[PDB]
Design a protein around this ligand. Structure first.
Ligand SMILES: CC(C)n1c(CC[C@@H](O)C[C@@H](O)CC(=O)O)c(-c2ccc(F)cc2)c(-c2ccc(F)cc2)c1C(=O)Nc1ccccc1
Ligand SMILES: CC(C)n1c(CC[C@@H](O)C[C@@H](O)CC(=O)O)c(-c2ccc(F)cc2)c(-c2ccc(F)cc2)c1C(=O)Nc1ccccc1
Ligand SMILES: CC(C)n1c(CC[C@@H](O)C[C@@H](O)CC(=O)O)c(-c2ccc(F)cc2)c(-c2ccc(F)cc2)c1C(=O)Nc1ccccc1
Ligand SMILES: CC(C)n1c(CC[C@@H](O)C[C@@H](O)CC(=O)O)c(-c2ccc(F)cc2)c(-c2ccc(F)cc2)c1C(=O)Nc1ccccc1
Lengths: 416, 394, 392, 401
């Protein structure tokens, strides 16, 4: 009825003795507040069921959520960690491009997308590479960043703090405070910029196999606590002052790197360019120069000297539990093509991606389906013997798959 | 046919270099084939695949399919936008993102609501052609800028589809390269394939006037699609949108745990000065990409287009009788979006579109559903900016 | 003053007849305040025509700075020959540019085209709300709205002919980019006059509009900006030439294949790694700056006027000939007004056959000068790139 | 050749008895006169050089050093803006320009700064750069070279080869970027008081010679691969700095903003945010978050014998304005300029008229007891004068009319 239901709710034995309708009655009349539903209802799926039911009555079409699935999904690894106000899950089709012949190994790359032909095209690119003797890649740099903004009374004071951070002694003190927060914390050279009394400080460090935002933030907050002891008039405006730079386009990531900086390359014989890619080396180069270099230049691109790196980065990231919003900066790529061999008929190809933001532990990689795709690549979880090696390998795979994707689309655009 | 054989027998046929009548059994066999090639043969255990509607995916949205990836969906709302309320779905695995955005919606609702406008509408495709000499490409640019030249090109472009309605051309020369940016609305479709078809016919017509022209590529990165580029920021691409709200001083204190004065200081020195020092083009915001990407995954959009669709400048100012109220606006000139085609043909993705009342084509007013979804995106972005900026202020 | 002494006038102030004595007195007054009173010893000031400078080109004038002018030519451009003046203090610059001119000449000369023409100004206005700024953008975009604004703008001057508007919104800010030719003048003052009269007219339709500044940096004038690269500003120009393989080896001391390699990997890839917007060239700014100083241009406008993409590819039957092109979207320039009122810089404009207004075809002298700047830049690219390729 | 006449030498070249442009070796003031006379008859108007000055100017320091094929010189009017009250000092700033009202406006900016207790500046960083592109057979090999250059022992070997070419050559930390088999190497060092291009180029070439021993396969494609970056707009100069990075600031009392600048603190903050931050942002600027730094930079440079072409990057500036004081009524202003490329020795600073302008500011030539102090000081004057210019123009725009 209503009164009886509240007696049963407050009875230490609880909400599981009420029906869905009785609980909703109690919400509509203002006896139980919308937010408290999380702790009161026992099972996670039943919490989702009720939130959906409440939501449906507020929609102009109450049957809207019919085909949004929710049942029998492991919400235990999601509640309090990955999502709030959960009403179900969104299934994204997963496909496989491979084998990807990279650094003398073969990889079957999972790709989550709803764009027709993207996987097939990426697959034909892998085929060209494989018959061409495989690709090779190198991690050139490694370190996630966080770029807080502090304010001092005057610009002369901000300059003083900058000079202090650049002394051997001052940096060593900040480094100890940063490095004390974690096993993996290992602060690299600080990069700083002034704008008046503003001072942007870019902390960079490895972070084992995790993407590292949480870890770099704990090291950063304690590093600024130490800096405040030497400069007590300094104010910390924001733990992020956009100098990182995270999830926005920025030259600083392209130039300094962020996360993993990777280069990949292959040489495709003329015969493979002809039979797999249906074009010539000469035609490919002409398209690459005038589209990926000259065209991006006329559009005023910073870091966007590629055909569709973002397609590959986004499909792999969604499949592999990465933060897909980091496609903004992680897609940064320059794709170069030149003639190779004795008569300039073989295609040399390289992709350079200075800011791959990636990890195999933490965040979405804690969910089991996301982990199935990480296991396909042999990169799931933390590498105990060699910390960071799995995330490094996953970066290489992304760069190699991007190259495969650049090969195929460019050959398609070359013919017509 | 294949139904009279077992799994092991069909697999024997594939291994000897030599069809299946259900989509799901096709998926199963591909998974078994793939699993023998992996170092951990059990790695696919927790990748689900059963009972998914593969009939709308095969031959349309994905190839070599081995299952699906579940992304948790949460709701941020109610979002009070243009005298209406929306419950915004957000597919994400980042803890706190949905809660933070939800808090931004709460501040906006208590402050009277947000208001938005679509400022421009047209998807683009930017091919690169070339002529024997730069003088020749200059002749072609000139011809295209005459009203008679543009009219014959518009006639060719427009004949390919109902919604193909060529707007003003934008051209750029680099030596004998000519980059031509074609632009048009596309109903409620995002419109890539449609504009591509109009482009092919228009260039074919241009060749009749200029036979020495070579079409080097149907995209010469002048569009620009899925790469950062100032041209999308300055000219727009897809929907250009602005949203705004005024948040009373009291609400900023109670819901957001800061003050108007503090919000302004952080916005200016983070989203304007900070982004400036970082050398940003179009990234003058805190985390528009989090909300764009989450809404996109949930609503069947092309998540790769978060690259350009995330472009956003966030501005905060003093407001009201005593300058204690918080004016906020987000401006997003290049939201690339649609409610038909691509991932929006799938049923779960269509559930999230039905939530917002923007699913499929609007018959009475073509494009209105895609326009409305772009406004919701800009409003949900503004909500997400409100809260995170407030969190960073404290 | 005529009956007084240099010293008595100086004591009057502490406690004029001609311009040169006004300069002499200012120099002496200033020399008192310097730690080294004889600093101005070798700063020349005598026998300079100060009448055209006062109240027009410079204030508090203590003299003038001599910048060596050298000549690079002949430059065979559009079947004409040009002796290009270059005011510089950088050694080897004129000499290198000259070698590039010689290379082009032996390849049959350069061809250029003006692709677009219109100086801009980009005010920022504010409305009470973003919805009001959007209403104004929409109004400006209708044919009737644009026509009202065009009539206003065009009424201020005989050369004021308003082209298509370009606008951008940022909340309640609206940025409006006005564009028009301006005869042979660079045209900032003219464009500004037309802009303010047009904004006044816009205010009659939208009284709540606040005009924040007549430049809101949307122009964009004398700062690096992608809008100039993509939409253009002033004159947009392309120049090209084909250098025979024999000329590349003999005059330039390199090969076609080596030139293409250096250009791709320095001017495209290198500039791309450096995060350049509009700087896809070797040293356009050197040539631009030198011509500008010599021809009475606003040298500060070298910021955007130097915007350039230099391309090189194989040409001819053998694929051994060198094709070169420079594309310069935003050359800001004029042959009337400002520093081109002065007689010495007019001498340099007279060398080029472009001094003053073109009466038969207004704007044609400024266009011609922009073609010369782009051609001379291409010559400078040719030579510096050759020298980088051959490597000492 | 002095025993012949003008008309005779010209008759010899026209008749082709003597090679034309190989005559000024046999013949400086008269060498110019003959080049002009020969040149005038090739022109559509043979009297066009009439009013181009050439007599009574020292061409000896100019010939084979600053200019070639010289036909005269171009006078640029020089105004003075001052006193500029900067770091407890007072400067009279030479500004060579032909733009009306520029000197006057900058002057009003100086006047407001002086009446607000003056400005303060700091050099934040210092070092000229050169950014060659080298090529290895493969990206993997280019990666090898980048890892080697990053080891402390690889760096010291390169640092010793770099520092050997000059006493001022002190190589700072190397910055590298890979693009396939391309490696771009940004060499940076102080250069005393010189702007330092030729000096850094010397040390770079020797340094690459050393690197060529450890990796014989390396091709030096070009001594500049645009990674410096010199005389083109580039985010790398904005983010890393180049030449001198400098910051300047002052507080203008409210009353001074009203009486001298004819506006208010509130109006100035508003215009600055929406023009120099938001406006530049909408226009797609990297490094151009200012009103007209280029005007001031260009004018000082021309007057002081700097390379005016380097105004492209030297003008990079962000101008910030903010409420100051107890009632938020005073104006805080600051200009940050990360890439002022400048020098007081070498190039155009060797010419005497240019040296007079340098002497005016007390920075001509080398500072013997503190090397580089004169160029640093000039950099600070540039940034201070830029801030004066921003003050005045922004107030003019804020008021209107
Ligand atoms: C499937 C993808 C990878 N793809 C695209 C879309 C890429 C899109 O998401 C980003 C681009 O917009 C980025 C850019 O280039 O600016 C096109 C495509 C591209 C551009 C265009 F204008 C029209 C179509 C093509 C394609 C290009 C030429 C053909 F003649 C045909 C198709 C393919 C593609 O790779 N198809 C493909 C199928 C089976 C096997 C091999 C190959
Ligand atoms: C959940 C998200 C939206 N969030 C983040 C991550 C945003 C991330 O995806 C983009 C950023 O990297 C973009 C940028 O700013 O550069 C932070 C966060 C940000 C930066 C940082 F260094 C440390 C943490 C915060 C946060 C900020 C201040 C606090 F004091 C605490 C948390 C929140 C956040 O919104 N938390 C939140 C929870 C419940 C309710 C309300 C509010
Ligand atoms: C005279 C000028 C045009 N020049 C320069 C300086 C250009 C300078 O102001 C802009 C550059 O910095 C822009 C850039 O490329 O980044 C160099 C020069 C360039 C770079 C460098 F590291 C060392 C020297 C060269 C040069 C280059 C290679 C040689 F092996 C020798 C000289 C010349 C030049 O063109 N000299 C020259 C003389 C007679 C005839 C032909 C040719
Ligand atoms: C003398 C210069 C420094 N100045 C300019 C031109 C600057 C020009 O080279 C760069 C700009 O284009 C950069 C930019 O803002 O984008 C304007 C000017 C600017 C823009 C415009 F649209 C109309 C005029 C002004 C000015 C501005 C408002 C007034 F109401 C009047 C004039 C002055 C100026 O400083 N005048 C001035 C005179 C005596 C004393 C004090 C002050």
């Amino acid at each position: 009825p209503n009164e009886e239901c509240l007696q049963i709710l407050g009875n230490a034995e609880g909400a599981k003795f009420l029906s869905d309708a009785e609980i909703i009655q109690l919400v509509n009349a203002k006896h139980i507040p919308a937010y408290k539903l999380e702790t009161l209802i026992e099972t996670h799926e039943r919490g989702v069921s009720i939130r959906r039911q409440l939501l449906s009555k507020k929609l102009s079409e109450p049957s809207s959520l019919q085909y949004l699935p929710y049942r029998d999904y492991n919400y235990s690894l999601v509640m309090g960690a990955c999502c709030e106000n959960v009403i179900g899950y969104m299934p994204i089709p997963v496909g496989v491009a491979g084998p990807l012949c990279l650094d003398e190994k073969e990889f079957q790359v999972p790709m989550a997308t709803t764009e027709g032909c993207l996987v097939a095209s990426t697959n034909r690119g892998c085929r060209a590479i494989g018959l061409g003797g495989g690709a090779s890649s190198r991690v050139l740099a490694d370190g996630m960043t966080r770029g807080p903004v502090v304010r001092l009374p005057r610009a002369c004071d901000s300059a003083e703090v900058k000079a202090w951070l650049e002394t051997s002694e001052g940096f060593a003190v900040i480094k100890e405070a940063f490095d004390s927060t974690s096993r993996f914390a290992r602060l690299q050279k600080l990069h700083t910029s002034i704008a008046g009394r503003n001072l942007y400080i870019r902390f960079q460090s490895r972070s084992g196999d995790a993407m590292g935002m949480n870890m770099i933030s704990k090291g950063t907050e304690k590093a600024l606590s130490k800096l405040h002891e030497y400069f007590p008039e300094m104010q910390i405006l924001a733990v992020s002052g956009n100098y990182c730079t995270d999830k926005k386009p920025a030259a600083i990531n392209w130039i300094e790197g962020r996360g993993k900086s990777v280069v990949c390359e292959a040489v495709i014989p003329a015969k493979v360019v002809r039979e797999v890619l249906k074009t010539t080396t000469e035609a490919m180069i002409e398209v690459n120069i005038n589209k990926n270099l000259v065209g991006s230049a006329m559009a005023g691109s910073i870091g966007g000297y590629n055909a569709h790196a973002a397609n590959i980065v986004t499909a792999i990231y969604i499949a592999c539990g990465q933060d897909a919003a980091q496609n903004v900066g992680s897609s940064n790529c320059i794709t170069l093509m030149e003639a190779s061999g004795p008569t300039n008929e073989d295609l040399y190809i390289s992709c350079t991606m200075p800011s791959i933001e990636i990890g195999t532990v933490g965040g979405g990689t804690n969910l089991l389906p996301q982990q199935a795709c990480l296991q396909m690549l042999g990169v799931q979880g933390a590498c105990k013997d060699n910390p960071g090696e799995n995330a490094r390998q996953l970066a290489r795979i992304v760069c190699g798959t991007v190259m495969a994707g650049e090969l195929s689309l460019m050959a398609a655009l070359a013919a017509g």
